[PDB]
Amino acid sequence: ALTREQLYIFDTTGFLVIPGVFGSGEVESFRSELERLDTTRRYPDLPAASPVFARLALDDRLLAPVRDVVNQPLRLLEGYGLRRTKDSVLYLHGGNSELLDLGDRQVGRDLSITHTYHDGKLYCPYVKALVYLSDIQSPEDGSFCYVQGSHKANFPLLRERAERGENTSLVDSGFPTLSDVFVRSGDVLLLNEALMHGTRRKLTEGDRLLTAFGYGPTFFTEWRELDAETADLRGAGYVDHDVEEDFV
Amino acid sequence: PALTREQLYIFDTTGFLVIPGVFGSGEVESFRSELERLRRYPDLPAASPVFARLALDDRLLAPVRDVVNQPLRLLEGYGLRRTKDSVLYLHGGNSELLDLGDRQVGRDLSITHTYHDGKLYCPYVKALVYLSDIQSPEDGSFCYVQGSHKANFPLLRERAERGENTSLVDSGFPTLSDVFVRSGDVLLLNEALMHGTRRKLTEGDRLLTAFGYGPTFFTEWRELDAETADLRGAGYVDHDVEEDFV
Amino acid sequence: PALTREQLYIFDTTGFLVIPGVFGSGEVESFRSELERLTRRYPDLPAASPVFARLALDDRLLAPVRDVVNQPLRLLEGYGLRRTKDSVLYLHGGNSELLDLGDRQVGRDLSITHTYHDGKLYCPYVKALVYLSDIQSPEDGSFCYVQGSHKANFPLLRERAERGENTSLVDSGFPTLSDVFVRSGDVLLLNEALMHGTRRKLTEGDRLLTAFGYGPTFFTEWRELDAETADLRGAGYVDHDVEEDFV
Amino acid sequence: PALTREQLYIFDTTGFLVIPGVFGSGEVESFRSELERLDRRYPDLPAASPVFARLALDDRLLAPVRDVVNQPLRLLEGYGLRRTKDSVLYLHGGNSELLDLGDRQVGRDLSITHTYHDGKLYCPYVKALVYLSDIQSPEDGSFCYVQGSHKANFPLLRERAERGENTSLVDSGFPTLSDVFVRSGDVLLLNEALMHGTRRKLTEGDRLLTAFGYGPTFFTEWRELDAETADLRGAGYVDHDVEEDFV
Structure with missing residues (x-):
């Protein structure tokens, strides 16, 4: 379903923006389920x-x-x-x-x-x-x-920034290889979770809605944060690595 | 109890590592006894x-x-x-x-x-x-x-399609090797290895216990036949095994 | 003048590294001057x-x-x-x-x-x-x-050749094709695995640069080669699909 | 003489491949004869x-x-x-x-x-x-x-040399050191990344073989180099830790 060119882009960049997947007839229906869930x-x-x-x-x-x-x-x-x-x-x-x-x-x-x-x-x-x-x-x-x-990086980036005592996030201070991605309502952004990513500080009025779905292999457990391995090794979960929230 | 450099070299290169004399005679017999109780x-x-x-x-x-x-x-x-x-x-x-x-x-x-x-x-x-x-x-x-744990090529698919009836465990293979152990030994195994057991001919009974470990996000082990209609089915779909055609 | 943690991270992740102001303009002019000897x-x-x-x-x-x-x-x-x-x-x-x-x-x-x-x-x-x-x-x-492109697992150019395209991406544009701007006396350290090129120069003037390639000692000095010789004695570098092949 | 699927599997997994009976016994005899002429x-x-x-x-x-x-x-x-x-x-x-x-x-x-x-x-x-x-x-x-050892991620020989070992593994043995047995007319195809050597010959009478090394057209012909030279012009191969360094 993905072209050769799409696959090349997802492989080299770690994500792919697929334009106009849902017409705003379905988008509205999706927002309505979101407004509705605010009870x-x-x-x-x-x-x-x-x-x-x-x-x-x-x-x-x-x-x-x-x-x-x-x-x-x-x-x-x-x-x-x-x-x-x-x-x-x-x-x-x-x-x-x-x-x-x-x-x-x-x-x-x-x-x-x-x-x-x-x-x-x-x-x-x-x-x-x-x-x-x-x-x-x-x-x-x-x-x-x-x-x-960053999805194919061999070197750690953030640990060094922490022991240097940096206290600002790169999404604020900027980074030579930090890049933004603009999208339209109804676009799909397919993402390799190995990519180091985040979100700029929104300065503008008016809300911003998105849904996200995470897929993996059948032997992966459903996503649940875990702080360390459990005392008896029975517990499932995802222990994250260095994230900017650790020190910013 | 932590692996030496030479031990790590061997596990990496061969896909397993036999660790001798881990559990004493008393412990083995305790494990035997307990296994018998069930x-x-x-x-x-x-x-x-x-x-x-x-x-x-x-x-x-x-x-x-x-x-x-x-x-x-x-x-x-x-x-x-x-x-x-x-x-x-x-x-x-x-x-x-x-x-x-x-x-x-x-x-x-x-x-x-x-x-x-x-x-x-x-x-x-x-x-x-x-x-x-x-x-x-x-x-x-x-x-x-x-x-076989770092193999880049498939081995069994071709033998199915060529219509082999028999298992390499029985017939042999130029790189098939055996491992021999004593009671109390641990065999540390990379599951990427292609392995099995020789058909036992001798009398008496062999006993062992096995413990599988993975990262915390791995689900506990259970066979899955395929992915399910609602993408909710959890478990391990195996790849080509000799059981599929022998 | 070794590479910081950050510079190593950038070179590895992007396939290149701009190192600003390595040579002063005195040294640049001495380099400029020498090249005009020819x-x-x-x-x-x-x-x-x-x-x-x-x-x-x-x-x-x-x-x-x-x-x-x-x-x-x-x-x-x-x-x-x-x-x-x-x-x-x-x-x-x-x-x-x-x-x-x-x-x-x-x-x-x-x-x-x-x-x-x-x-x-x-x-x-x-x-x-x-x-x-x-x-x-x-x-x-x-x-x-x-x-x-220094770590791509798929080919980009073969399908473009077979589809009949006659234009360079350098002129066409391509979504993940970007430019690098430099200053006189900057060094660009480049992994030759990167797929790269230059924009068509449309402005008057002459830009000057010098380039030095390095490799292991068992690598032969760079020399273009069309194919392996019949007696297997011919040395040199055979390239893969490049855009000059069909543009 | 195209390598079959299993042969490729074996070479990939072991870092070598014995191909049996490639050359007839008369061709072998011709090669032997040619080697003693060169004496x-x-x-x-x-x-x-x-x-x-x-x-x-x-x-x-x-x-x-x-x-x-x-x-x-x-x-x-x-x-x-x-x-x-x-x-x-x-x-x-x-x-x-x-x-x-x-x-x-x-x-x-x-x-x-x-x-x-x-x-x-x-x-x-x-x-x-x-x-x-x-x-x-x-x-x-x-x-x-x-x-x-052709796909090893860890060094074997450094620790041995630093620990003051005197004997080679080809003599002392090692849990995963194995032998290959061949007939005249056989070819051994070998990934040079494999860690290898030969047993100490104790039997009587010379054994003969010929070896040909192949690589890409940009590899330089084989020659040992002790180190990189000061003018970066030296060509050849610098080996890594080998048993003859401390044995």
């Missing part, structure tokens, strides 16, 4: 709290590109909505080689995002399809931003 | 606080940590009795194929391991605690295809 | 002048080069470049571009196949471009590159 | 003999070599070998062995650093060993190697 927040577990979103998660407009970059037996790992309002922000997280202190060691791989390629197919264990439900067209409007090539 | 024995730590302790013993955890290097989760833990004429055909292999029903894939992300800055990173490893000696092929020895 | 390409500079022979070994070039090759070093080429109005350099390089070896197609060029191991980059072929004049807009013929 | 190592056999020059280009060597290099090909090496009683070759090679460059330590040797891509192996330096006599026991001076 600057995050709308958790959408597929369980709405039949309209349970259907979206399984939509071939989402599954088809996802299969093309995961190429494993698939499992829906998460689905949530987002309302980004004025002054909201999201610092950088992700990145292929960020460090994590375990008890005895430091590790530089996060296998939940560690991706490869073999015989014409990408194999990314964790990707996210962001369905945009309103336009985002400048940095100050709170645009998706990313560190170029 | 042919596969699924979910050991559940039904035996003796085996629950075993699963978290540092003599297993410290070497496992050195080849996984992630926050750990216990994925499976089972006991095993092998009788005469029992055989496990070949399964695993880094590049075996799998048809997804609209494409053909050559990686299994549940065993796809890597290496980075001085540390191995294997997402699925298994610790075999042997409770009896296995010292010859006819004893039903552990066997494996050399370097 | 559009145009001026090959084997280290031979033709003691100034460039000295530049090829300047620790300000060798120190960053060593950090990205991390092998016993050999100087493989050194050349000058005078770029005039309407000169253009179509895209070449790229990690997974195809090559017909006759009986088969191959997708790795082992002369630019790079890796990473225990905290070090191992890039077998890197260039250091020393700029002798400003390039601050695309119309001035700026260096341009396809983002992340 | 230990026999350097540059192709320059010495149009018989070995033709062997080097023989398709029964080039076809399997192309299947594991998959680059524009160059003949880098061609020598004869006379193995006598008490001769031994200590371990050399290995994918991750250390080398000290003078201001740093490195763990990749790009001359043997191999990869795989879209159904093809890409080994930059492979050897085809043509045996002119049977070697059927370790005491006969058999080829031996460390298992999976």
Whole structure:
């Protein structure tokens, strides 16, 4: 379903913007399920709290590109909505080689995002399809931003900034290889979660709505943050590596 | 209890590592006794606080940590009795194929391991605690295809399509090798390895316990036939195994 | 003059690194002047002048080069470049571009196949471009590159050839094709795995630069080769799909 | 003589491949005869003999070599070998062995650093060993190697040297050191990234073989180099830790 050129772009940049996937007849229907669920927040577990979103998660407009970059037996790992309002922000997280202190060691791989390629197919264990439900067209409007090539980085970036005592986020201060991505309502942004990315500080009025769905292999557990391994090793979850929220 | 440099070299290069004399005679007999109190024995730590302790013993955890290097989760833990004429055909292999029903894939992300800055990173490893000696092929020895854990080419798909009826475990292969162990030994295994067991011909019974470990985001081990209609089905879809055509 | 953590991170992630103001304008003019002793390409500079022979070994070039090759070093080429109005350099390089070896197609060029191991980059072929004049807009013929093409797993150019395209992306534009602006006396350290080229220079004037390629000691000095010789004795570099093949 | 699927699997997984019965016993006899006319190592056999020059280009060597290099090909090496009683070759090679460059330590040797891509192996330096006599026991001076050492991520030999070891693994043994047994007329196809050597020959009577080394057209012909030279002009191969450094 993805062209050769699309695949080349997702592989080299770590994400792909697919224009105009949903006509604003469906977009409105999606926002209405979001207004309706209000009875600057995050709308958790959408597929369980709405039949309209349970259907979206399984939509071939989402599954088809996802299969093309995961190429494993698939499992829906998460689905949530987002309302980004004025002054909201999201610092950088992700990145292929960020460090994590375990008890005895430091590790530089996060296998939940560690991706490869073999015989014409990408194999990314964790990707996210962001369905945009309103336009985002400048940095100050709170645009998706990313560190170029960070999904294939061999070096850690953030640990050094922490021991230097840096206290500002790169999405504020800027970085030579930090880049923004502008989208339209109804666009899909297919994302390799190994990419180090975040969101500019929204300075403009008027809310910003998006839904996101996370897919991975059938042997991955549904997304749940975990702070460390459990005392008896029975517990499931995702332990993150160095993120800017740790020190900014 | 932590692996030496030479031990790590051997695990990386061959896909496994036999660790001698981990558990004493008394401990083995304790494990034997407990196993008898309860042919596969699924979910050991559940039904035996003796085996629950075993699963978290540092003599297993410290070497496992050195080849996984992630926050750990216990994925499976089972006991095993092998009788005469029992055989496990070949399964695993880094590049075996799998048809997804609209494409053909050559990686299994549940065993796809890597290496980075001085540390191995294997997402699925298994610790075999042997409770009896296995010292010859006819004893039903552990066997494996050399370097099969970092193979780039599939091996079994072609043999299915060429119509082979028999297992390499029986017929042999130029790189098929056996492993011999004593009671008390641990066999630390990368599940990317293509392995199985020799058909046991001798009498008596072989006993062992096995503990599978992976990162905390791996689901506990269970067979899945395929991905499900609602993308909610969880578990492990295997790739081409000899059971599929032998 | 080794590379910071950050510079290493940028080179590895983008396939190149601009190192601002390495040589003062006194040294630039001395480089400028020497090149006028002779559009145009001026090959084997280290031979033709003691100034460039000295530049090829300047620790300000060798120190960053060593950090990205991390092998016993050999100087493989050194050349000058005078770029005039309407000169253009179509895209070449790229990690997974195809090559017909006759009986088969191959997708790795082992002369630019790079890796990473225990905290070090191992890039077998890197260039250091020393700029002798400003390039601050695309119309001035700026260096341009396809983002992340130094680690691409698919070919970009073969499908474009087979589909009939007759235009360079350098002129066409392409979504992930971007420009690099430099200042006189800046160095651009380049992983030759990057698919790169230059914008067509539309402005009057001459931009001058010199370029030095480095690799391991078992690499032969750069020399173009069309194919393997019949007696397997011919040495040199066979390229894969480049845009000059069909534009 | 195209390598089958299983042969490629075996070569990829073990770093070598024995191809049985490539040359007839008369061809073998011709080669043996040609080696004694040239009367230990026999350097540059192709320059010495149009018989070995033709062997080097023989398709029964080039076809399997192309299947594991998959680059524009160059003949880098061609020598004869006379193995006598008490001769031994200590371990050399290995994918991750250390080398000290003078201001740093490195763990990749790009001359043997191999990869795989879209159904093809890409080994930059492979050897085809043509045996002119049977070697059927370790005491006969058999080829031996460390298992999976062509894809090793850790160094083996540094720790051994630093710990003050005196003996080579080809003598003392090692848990994963294995032997290869061959018939005259067999070819051994070898990824030079494999850590290998030969057992100490205890049996009587010379054994003979010829070896040809192949790599891409930009590799320089084989020659040892002790280090990178001050003027960056030195060409050849600097080895990493080998057992003859401390044994």
